[PDB]
Amino acid sequence: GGAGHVPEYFVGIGTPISFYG
Amino acid sequence: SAWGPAATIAARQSATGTKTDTPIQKVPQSISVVTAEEMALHQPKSVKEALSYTPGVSVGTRGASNTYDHLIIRGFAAEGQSQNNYLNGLKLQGNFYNDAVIDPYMLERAEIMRGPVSVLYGKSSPGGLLNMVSKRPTTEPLKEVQFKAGTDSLFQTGFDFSDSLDDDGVYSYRLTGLARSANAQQKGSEEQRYAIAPAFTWRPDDKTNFTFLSYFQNEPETGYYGWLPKEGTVEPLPNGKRLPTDFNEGAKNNTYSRNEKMVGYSFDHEFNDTFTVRQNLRFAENKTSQNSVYGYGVCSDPANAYSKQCAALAPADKGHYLARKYVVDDEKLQNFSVDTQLQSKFATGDIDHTLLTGVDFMRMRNDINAWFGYDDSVPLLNLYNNTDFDFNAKDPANSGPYRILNKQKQTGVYVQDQAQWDKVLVTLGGRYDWADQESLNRVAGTTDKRDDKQFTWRGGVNYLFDNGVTPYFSYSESFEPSSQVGKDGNIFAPSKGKQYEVGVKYVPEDRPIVVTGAVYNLTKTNNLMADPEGSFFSVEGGEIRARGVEIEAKAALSASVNVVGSYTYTDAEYTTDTTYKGNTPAQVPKHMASLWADYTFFDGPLSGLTLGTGGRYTGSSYGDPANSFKVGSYTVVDALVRYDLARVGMAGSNVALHVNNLFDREYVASCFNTYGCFWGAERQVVATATFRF
Ligand SMILES: CCCCCCCCCCCC[N+](C)(C)[O-]
Ligand SMILES: CCCCCCCCCCCC[N+](C)(C)[O-]
Ligand SMILES: CCCCCCCCCCCC[N+](C)(C)[O-]
Ligand SMILES: CCCCCCCCCCCC[N+](C)(C)[O-]
Ligand SMILES: CCCCCCCCCCCC[N+](C)(C)[O-]
Ligand SMILES: CCCCCCCCCCCC[N+](C)(C)[O-]
Ligand SMILES: CCCCCCCCCCCC[N+](C)(C)[O-]
Ligand SMILES: CCCCCCCCCCCC[N+](C)(C)[O-]
Ligand SMILES: CCCCCCCCCCCC[N+](C)(C)[O-]
Ligand SMILES: CCCCCCCCCCCC[N+](C)(C)[O-]
């Protein structure tokens, strides 16, 4: 849901890309 | 013992907190200085270990990994967990995985600024800033060649050469280089570095200095950067057993490279007693690429709730099976900075003034060409048990692209006055920044833009007692733009830092002692938090507060005994957050401390022998923002034996043996979440031979 390096646990093919890295 | 007066007298001078050359007791904020002599004694693997004995930093958060120089200063890290690192007063501006590192062998010093410093540097973390200083051409000639060999197949060859070209020394050069090879702690993971630093100084007179500074580095492999669960590290598996400290959850064919190229200069000219001009400029190009399979916790972890592979297993096997994901990445970034300053010294009756007026401009461009593996994109790893992975066969069912072009630019105009009235020194300044960002998602064809206009100021007072005791107070501010887009499709407003600090600096002119104390209240406002109405989008308005006590002490006890040490109390909390109000942020211990001492023999048959030992203590921290579990405390001990070869007719030459984590303690450095834990560094033993000609 934020800035980072690794996509969040909910991020998929039909999902907006947010990070937690 | 060069490190002795270096740590106590040479380290009294600084420029990072004021942009003017100001003694540390005259700086109205917390600042620490690590000299090249202290770095030659301790031989730190990176700039982070060089700061181990300074307060208010977490230099070991990532454990064994040495990919980046990430620091948690006063409970805070930079927006998007990027580094907030400077080189020669200019930002090493990074984005995503494309962040640059400078080898400590190439540095003259490192200065760390704690708290908000936007007043001089623009957008910056509320926690602080690190500024490194490149090795400069020397007066006297230098002809150093160094060799290292240690644990985990460590091998290093370095050289450091400097001299005048002419007889008057108006043209001088420096050339520092190194080649390093080692295995990472983790099985199948290797590290490689080849770095060279050409430098050239033109000093036509005692009032002018133009120095060309360049840095080139190539790292075919940077090593481990994986994630591991609290199940098998902090806590035991259902089995009752734990994963080894060399455990690697990646693929046999995980690769990770970095390439860095920089050119620029440092210019200063003194016109007269009133006016001095300064200009710092750098052009840099950074590249990174990786193929990395990495861990995403055990199947009983809520992060793996949508994983099919995990759902398939029996509730008796979920707790010891590890869900994994992957990232394929290719980045190229270009960065440019110019800081231009005018320094004006004058008096107004009983008040002496040092007025600084400057213009600062930076631009960064980062082109990301990536591919991410989502749920069920890589097979599970039985933790009760290494093969290749196909990175090139990118499956539309569980993997997708990530192609972005990120642009940033910032212009700042700032004014500062250091006004001295008798023993009262007043520091007052302000900065105005125009920070503009622009992100092109090449897949979606959309551009997100935001232009921020922000004002920050700092006001301080230092009362200089004649005995060296200097109480001080300051208010200081910072801002950080957001890179994140809300429900409504717009980039969020910036986060801000607001700090109050009171302290006392003990810097006596007649004794080799530096002792500082500081108590502070640092607040981060407009922090991003969870949507209260529930969505995949964050909301702004959150708040994090850090209050703490910091003590640093550095003294030459006797002619042969040297001490360095620190203590930190950090009370960090979410004061406003949808999910975590009242909790403590992860990886932030309440208590940290360190103490080092060295003895040098100068008279008997053990003449020129240095013996040194130090201990670094990290209290307990929380392993997640939910504060569902804790990471246990640990104390690590380092030791060294150094022998000057002057008695064997080789003055300047020495041989040493360093031992890091002497008692080979097994510990979890930290966890940022239940699925993201890092094993601490295992005992390291290194032999170094450095010869002067
Ligand atoms: C990046 C800006 C560089 C400007 C270079 C001009 C510096 C002038 C140095 C001359 C100093 C006086 N002297 C007597 C040696 O000619
Ligand atoms: C014993 C002295 C020899 C030390 C080894 C010096 C290696 C030089 C490093 C070259 C790296 C060049 N580059 C541009 C690819 O980074
Ligand atoms: C000593 C001053 C050197 C300044 C030279 C200016 C750099 C040239 C920039 C053009 C490079 C552009 N491109 C795309 C053709 O590589
Ligand atoms: C950005 C504005 C900066 C300009 C500040 C001007 C203050 C200069 C005061 C001159 C001091 C006068 N004097 C002759 C007694 O030294
Ligand atoms: C070092 C001296 C620099 C002068 C500072 C002038 C900057 C002020 C510009 C603010 C623009 C006004 N605003 C808030 C409507 O955008
Ligand atoms: C060199 C002197 C310039 C910096 C002066 C410091 C600015 C302090 C102004 C406080 C602004 C507070 N507020 C809420 C009214 O914006
Ligand atoms: C001598 C001082 C020089 C002042 C420099 C002026 C900086 C203002 C630039 C703002 C950038 C403009 N914008 C709209 C793209 O954000
Ligand atoms: C003239 C320098 C002396 C130090 C002054 C420090 C006073 C702190 C200012 C209070 C800050 C309040 N506020 C709301 C503007 O953030
Ligand atoms: C824990 C706070 C850190 C600051 C330590 C204060 C040191 C004060 C020493 C005073 C010594 C007085 N003497 C002997 C120079 O006259
Ligand atoms: C010598 C003066 C000492 C001043 C200390 C006062 C600290 C006040 C802290 C304000 C806290 C307010 N807030 C909302 C930013 O957390």
Residue with tokens 């023993």: B423
Torsion, CA B26, CA B29, CA B30, CA B36, rounded to 10: -50
Q: State which of B411, B432, B436 you would mutate to test the pocket of ligand 5, scoring each by most atoms of that ligand within 8 A of its C-beta.
A: B432
| Ligand nearest to the backbone CA of B575 | 10
Is the alpha carbon torsion for B454, B281, B176, B259 positive or negative? Answer: positive
**B319 lies in the same domain as B345:** yes
Phi, psi of B94 (to 5 degrees): -115, 170
Nearest Cα neighbor of B641 from B147, B2, B37, B43 is B43
Buried b (16+ CB within 10 A) or exposed e, B539-559: bbebbbbbbbbbbbbbbbeee
Which pair of structure tokens corresponds to residue B586?
């992860």
Contact A4 B327 (CB under 8 A): no
Distance B254 CA to ligand 3 centre (A): 36
Q: By three-state DSSP, how is residue B7 classified?
A: helix
* CA-proximal residue: ligand 7, atom 13 (nearest): B434
Q: By three-state DSSP, how is residue B38 classified?
A: helix
Last residue within a domain, chosen from B111, B141, B171: B141
Buried b (16+ CB within 10 A) or exposed e, B339-371: bebebeeeeeeeeeebbbebebbbbbbbbbbbb
Q: Quote the number of domains for chain B.
A: 2
- Distance CA(B513)–CA(B193), nearest Å, equals 37
**B321 lies in the same domain as B377:** yes
**B155 lies in the same domain as B45:** no
**Which residues form ligand 10's pocket by a CB distance below 6 Å?**
B 473, 498, 500, 502, 521, 523, 545
**B108 lies in the same domain as B187:** no
Residue with tokens 């492999």: B221
Contact A3 B537 (CB under 8 A): no
Q: Is B226 annotated as a binding residue?
A: yes
Residue with tokens 């002067």: B692
- Distance CA(B416)–CA(B459), nearest Å, equals 10
Phi, psi of B574 (to 5 degrees): -85, 115
Last residue within a domain, chosen from B141, B165, B193: B141
Distance B438 CA to ligand 5 centre (A): 23
B40: part of which helix (H) or strand (E)?
Answer: helix B36-42
Residue B628: other Cβ atoms inside 10 A: 12
**B189 lies in the same domain as B172:** yes
**B384 lies in the same domain as B509:** yes
Torsion, CA B132, CA B18, CA B519, CA B433, rounded to 10: -90
Q: Which residues of B touch A (CB under 8 A)?
A: 79-81, 96-97, 294, 296, 302-306, 325, 327, 372, 374-375, 396-398, 400, 402, 482-484, 528, 530, 536-538, 673
Task: Outline where DSSP puts E strands in B307-350.
Answer: 321-348
Residue with tokens 């200009």: B279
- Distance CA(B560)–CA(B608), nearest Å, equals 10
- Distance CA(B18)–CA(B233), nearest Å, equals 44
Q: Which residues lie across from B35 on neighbouring strands?
A: B109
Taking the CA of residue A13 and the nearest CA in chain B, the distance in Å comes to: 6
Q: By three-state DSSP, how is residue B533 classified?
A: coil
Last residue within a domain, chosen from B141, B174, B193: B141
Buried b (16+ CB within 10 A) or exposed e, A2-14: bbbbbbbbebeee
Contact B374 A13 (CB under 8 A): yes
- Report chain B residues whose CB lies below 8 A from the CB of A15: 536
**B125 lies in the same domain as B243:** no
Distance B465 CA to ligand 8 centre (A): 23
Buried b (16+ CB within 10 A) or exposed e, B383-418: beeeeebebeebeeebbbebebebbbbbebebebeb
The domain in which residue B593 lies consists of: 142-693
What Å resolution does this PDB entry report?
2.3
Which of B97, B225, B310, B375 is the mutation pick for testing A, counting most A CBs within 10 A? B375
Which pair of structure tokens corresponds to residue B612?
């040194």
**B152 lies in the same domain as B129:** no
Q: How far is CA B163 from the centre of its chain?
A: 31
Residue B467: other Cβ atoms inside 10 A: 11
Which pair of structure tokens corresponds to residue B637?
């001990």
Nearest Cα neighbor of B687 from B664, B661, B658, B660 is B658
Nearest Cα neighbor of B684 from B55, B66, B35, B56 is B66
CB of B306 within 6 A of ligand 4: the answer is: no
- Method for this entry: X-ray
Number of helices and strands in chain B (H, E): 5, 35
- Burial-class residue B171 by CB neighbours within 10 Å (0-12, 13-18, 19+): middle
Is the alpha carbon torsion for B101, B105, B108, B110 positive or negative? Answer: positive
Q: By three-state DSSP, how is residue B104 classified?
A: helix
**B26 lies in the same domain as B157:** no
**B190 lies in the same domain as B213:** yes
> What CATH number did the domain enclosing B573 receive?
2.40.170.20
**B128 lies in the same domain as B180:** no
> What CATH number did the domain enclosing B19 receive?
2.170.130.10
DSSP class per residue in B232-287: TTTBPPTTS----TT---S-TT-EEEEEEEEEEEEEEEE-SSSEEEEEEEEEEEEE
DSSP class per residue in B585-649: PTT--SEEEEEEEEEE--SSTTTTEEEEEEEEEE--EESSTT--SEEPPEEEEEEEEEEEGGGGT
- Distance CA(B615)–CA(B682), nearest Å, equals 15
Nearest Cα neighbor of B498 from B471, B465, B530, B474 is B474
Q: Which residues of A touch B (CB under 8 A)?
A: 1-7, 9-13, 15-21
Q: What is the DSSP letter of B2?
A: T
Taking the CA of residue B530 and the nearest CA in chain A, the distance in Å comes to: 8
**B153 lies in the same domain as B104:** no
CB of B385 within 6 A of ligand 4: the answer is: no
Q: By three-state DSSP, how is residue B55 classified?
A: coil
Write the residue in B306, B398, B538 that is nearest to A1 by C-beta. Answer: B538
- Report chain A residues whose CB lies below 8 A from the CB of B673: 20
Which of B70, B96, B485, B539 is the mutation pick for testing A, counting most A CBs within 10 A? B96
- Distance CA(B165)–CA(B522), nearest Å, equals 50
- Distance CA(B197)–CA(B189), nearest Å, equals 27
